[PDB]
Scaffold this active site. Structure first.
Site, mmCIF file in Angstrom:
data_model
loop_
_atom_site.group_PDB
_atom_site.id
_atom_site.type_symbol
_atom_site.label_atom_id
_atom_site.label_comp_id
_atom_site.label_asym_id
_atom_site.label_seq_id
_atom_site.Cartn_x
_atom_site.Cartn_y
_atom_site.Cartn_z
ATOM 1 N N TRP A 158 -6.957 -8.646 9.231
ATOM 2 C CA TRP A 158 -6.183 -8.678 7.875
ATOM 3 C C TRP A 158 -4.749 -9.355 7.808
ATOM 4 O O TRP A 158 -4.520 -10.189 8.252
ATOM 5 C CB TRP A 158 -6.192 -7.221 7.381
ATOM 6 N N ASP A 159 -3.831 -8.589 7.226
ATOM 7 C CA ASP A 159 -2.549 -8.984 7.386
ATOM 8 C C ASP A 159 -2.157 -9.615 8.682
ATOM 9 O O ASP A 159 -2.233 -8.977 9.684
ATOM 10 C CB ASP A 159 -1.677 -7.831 6.848
ATOM 11 N N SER A 172 1.869 -3.750 7.962
ATOM 12 C CA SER A 172 2.772 -5.064 8.332
ATOM 13 C C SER A 172 3.911 -5.086 8.534
ATOM 14 O O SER A 172 4.799 -3.951 8.211
ATOM 15 C CB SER A 172 2.175 -5.748 7.202
ATOM 16 N N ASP A 177 1.214 8.233 -8.626
ATOM 17 C CA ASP A 177 2.248 7.418 -8.163
ATOM 18 C C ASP A 177 2.022 6.750 -6.952
ATOM 19 O O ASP A 177 1.023 7.292 -6.103
ATOM 20 C CB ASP A 177 3.497 8.349 -7.900
ATOM 21 N N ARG A 185 7.779 -0.426 3.440
ATOM 22 C CA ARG A 185 6.813 -1.151 4.325
ATOM 23 C C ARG A 185 6.995 -2.600 4.342
ATOM 24 O O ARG A 185 7.828 -3.382 3.587
ATOM 25 C CB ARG A 185 5.312 -0.971 4.129
ATOM 26 N N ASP A 186 6.279 -3.467 5.141
ATOM 27 C CA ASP A 186 6.295 -4.825 5.314
ATOM 28 C C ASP A 186 7.810 -5.534 5.518
ATOM 29 O O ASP A 186 8.293 -6.225 4.990
ATOM 30 C CB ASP A 186 5.547 -5.543 4.168
ATOM 31 N N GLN A 213 11.850 5.705 -11.689
ATOM 32 C CA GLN A 213 10.705 5.787 -12.246
ATOM 33 C C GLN A 213 10.792 6.968 -13.385
ATOM 34 O O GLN A 213 11.672 7.774 -13.063
ATOM 35 C CB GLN A 213 9.602 5.986 -11.318
ATOM 36 N N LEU A 257 5.641 4.940 -13.959
ATOM 37 C CA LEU A 257 5.693 5.241 -12.505
ATOM 38 C C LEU A 257 5.980 3.926 -11.740
ATOM 39 O O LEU A 257 6.112 4.263 -10.650
ATOM 40 C CB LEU A 257 4.374 6.224 -12.121
ATOM 41 N N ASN A 289 7.885 1.507 -10.381
ATOM 42 C CA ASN A 289 9.205 1.169 -9.792
ATOM 43 C C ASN A 289 9.354 0.366 -8.556
ATOM 44 O O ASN A 289 10.042 0.609 -7.742
ATOM 45 C CB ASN A 289 10.107 2.411 -9.960
ATOM 46 N N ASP A 318 3.739 -0.773 -9.272
ATOM 47 C CA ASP A 318 4.659 -0.161 -8.205
ATOM 48 C C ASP A 318 4.312 -0.518 -7.014
ATOM 49 O O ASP A 318 4.963 -0.355 -5.887
ATOM 50 C CB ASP A 318 3.931 1.278 -8.009
ATOM 51 N N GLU A 319 3.600 -1.764 -7.013
ATOM 52 C CA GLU A 319 3.433 -2.558 -5.787
ATOM 53 C C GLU A 319 3.661 -3.935 -5.447
ATOM 54 O O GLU A 319 2.712 -4.876 -6.021
ATOM 55 C CB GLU A 319 1.770 -2.375 -5.307
ATOM 56 N N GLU A 352 4.110 -6.430 -2.734
ATOM 57 C CA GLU A 352 3.803 -6.571 -1.348
ATOM 58 C C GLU A 352 4.181 -7.710 -0.519
ATOM 59 O O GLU A 352 4.667 -8.521 -1.118
ATOM 60 C CB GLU A 352 2.084 -6.280 -1.178
HETATM 61 CA CA CA Z 1 6.715 4.664 -8.470
#
Ligand code: CA
Length: 448
Positions: free
Chosen positions: A61-62, A140, A218, A223-224, A249, A285, A287, A316-317, A319
């Site tokens: 994957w990543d 990652s 939430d 990460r990453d 949030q 949520l 943020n 919220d994501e 990446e």
């Molecule tokens: Ca959030």
């Protein structure tokens, strides 16, 4: 009234820019190139032991290349190195970092050899560390070739047993050459946690728990980590979420004009729809942030800095944080799923790479191509050539960057495992980008 406008001294991915994407995206300027199904191969060397102890073909994957400080692809004793998340296609959530390598001048996917896992199962328990003993998955990050010629890894310590706690983590990967054509992972050292959130600038897992995040939907992230240098300073730029003091949030965020952009009528109509609808909680949520910390020379935390950008109310994501300097300007990228977004006309099958540009590392980031759109991938997840985790690799010369990504490759017939997608080129010119016409590269190619 309840209406206000707080930028928190940071940049924002605005609702106004996002709503413009659906009518902009249907162009070969942004569309991920169509890939030739008949030529797609599994990574032949991507074999390892399953949970039972039998050797199997892994899903890969990543992935991220070993980079020089400036983001260009490193050469390590004549080799290009790629770190990749991999695991057993069936045994649920089990990712480990594997080290793949290729003679700098070799081109084929079959030329990628596998040095195995970076870490042994036992490695996490060795250091005296606040978090590592609790790790359940390796997520990652990035890899840099130091001045001293050391392989320095940054990755995410995910703890499923600690409510999904995520910790920016580092180690030096010790390498040797058993012969002229092989690289070996000898082991790791300087293996330690760096950062897991402070609460004021970046959300902690504790805040996530205390607010009942597993019941509200939430999404806590930390990460990453992407290593970058500027003017003698060392940084990690990473995926996170805002803390209590940089635009937290909650429902109040839906009244903050900074997240909307556009005019007052746009703000009022968009806000009313958000408050009435089934996306109210999701938007509240949302943020996401691309954070930045400075490191010491020993890679310990030096300073927690304010985020570079946030996606409050939008998602919220955000990446695969990515950042590099080109033509004296700073380019900042992140991948975003339409499924996690709250935007009219953006749907479940939409996947994006978004991009921003600033005159300085911590300055104001402005959207590329007016809206922030750089790449659009909307192939159904069932399609063989579905790609994900798009990542821009800067090049030694030229205006093009190489886009790498993984291809899930789950077809009815072989080949059958997640693999390196064919790489391709994106031209960068000021605040404008474009997919380069008819230049699809080899699977997992890093440099042109
Ligand atoms: Ca959030």
């Amino acid at each position: 009234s309840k209406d206000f406008n707080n930028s928190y001294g940071i940049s924002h991915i605005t609702r106004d820019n996002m709503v413009k994407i659906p009518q902009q995206q249907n162009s070969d300027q942004f569309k991920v190139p169509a890939f030739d199904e008949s030529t797609i191969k599994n990574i032949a060397s991507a074999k390892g032991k399953n949970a039972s102890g039998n050797t199997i073909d892994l899903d890969v994957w990543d992935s991220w290349p070993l980079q020089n400080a400036d983001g260009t692809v490193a050469t390590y004793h004549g080799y290009q190195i790629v770190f990749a998340l991999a695991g057993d296609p069936k045994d649920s959530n089990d990712t480990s970092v594997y080290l793949f390598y290729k003679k700098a001048g070799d081109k084929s996917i079959d030329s990628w050899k596998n040095a195995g896992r970076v870490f042994k199962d036992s490695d996490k328990f060795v250091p005296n560390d606040p978090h590592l003993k609790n790790q359940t998955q390796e997520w990652s990050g990035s890899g840099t070739l130091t001045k001293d010629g050391k392989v320095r890894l940054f990755y995410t310590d995910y703890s499923g047993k600690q409510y999904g706690k995520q910790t920016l983590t580092t180690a030096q990967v010790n390498m040797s050459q058993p012969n002229d054509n092989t690289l070996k992972v000898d082991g790791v050292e300087d293996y330690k946690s760096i950062f897991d959130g402070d609460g004021k600038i970046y959300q902690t897992v504790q805040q996530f728990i205390d607010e009942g995040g597993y019941d509200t939907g939430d999404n806590h992230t930390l990460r990453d980590p992407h290593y970058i240098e500027d003017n003698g300073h060392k940084y990690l730029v990473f995926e996170a979420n805002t803390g209590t003091e940089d635009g937290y949030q909650g429902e109040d965020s839906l009244y903050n004009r900074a997240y909307y952009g556009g005019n007052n009528p746009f703000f009022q109509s968009e806000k009313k729809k958000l408050l009435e609808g089934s996306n109210k909680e999701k938007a509240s949520l949302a943020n996401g942030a691309l954070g930045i910390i400075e490191l010491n020379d020993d890679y310990t935390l030096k300073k927690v800095m304010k985020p570079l950008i946030t996606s409050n109310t939008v998602t919220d994501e955000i990446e695969r944080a990515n950042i590099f300097k080109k033509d004296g300007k700073w380019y900042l990228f992140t991948d975003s799923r339409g499924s996690a977004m709250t935007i009219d006309g953006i749907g479940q099958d939409d996947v994006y790479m978004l991009g921003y540009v600033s005159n300085t590392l911590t300055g104001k980031y402005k959207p590329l191509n007016d809206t922030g759109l750089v790449l659009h991938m909307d192939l159904d997840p069932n399609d063989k050539t579905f790609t994900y985790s798009h990542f821009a690799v800067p090049q030694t010369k030229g205006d093009n960057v190489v886009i790498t990504s993984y291809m899930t490759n789950r077809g009815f017939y072989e080949d059958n495992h997640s693999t390196f997608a064919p790489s391709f080129l994106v031209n960068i010119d000021g605040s404008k980008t474009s997919v380069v016409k008819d230049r699809v590269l080899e699977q997992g190619q890093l440099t042109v």
